[PDB]
Amino acid sequence: GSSGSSGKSPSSPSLGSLQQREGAKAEVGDQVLVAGQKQGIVRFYGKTDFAPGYWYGIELDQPTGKHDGSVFGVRYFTCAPRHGVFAPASRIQRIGSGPSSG
Length: 102
Prior knowledge:
SH3 type barrels, structural protein, microtubule binding
């Protein structure tokens, strides 16, 4: 019983990193994982118009994307019909950690 003595709650909304300048986990031209399932590669990284914050225009291999490259008329990258998928970085994961290694 009883959590502790005094407490352990934060005074302000702070995290490991959520106030950097153009910060990001992945980058364009790297293998990622949308929602820890759909495996793709970031083709376009930048803020969209339909939604705030930043997004990753990752392209899929099979016709199963959210859109065909353009979202609500706004285009970001060129991809096959229903291939591009925009998901929050925090929602995306990284698979590769070295473009030139062996």
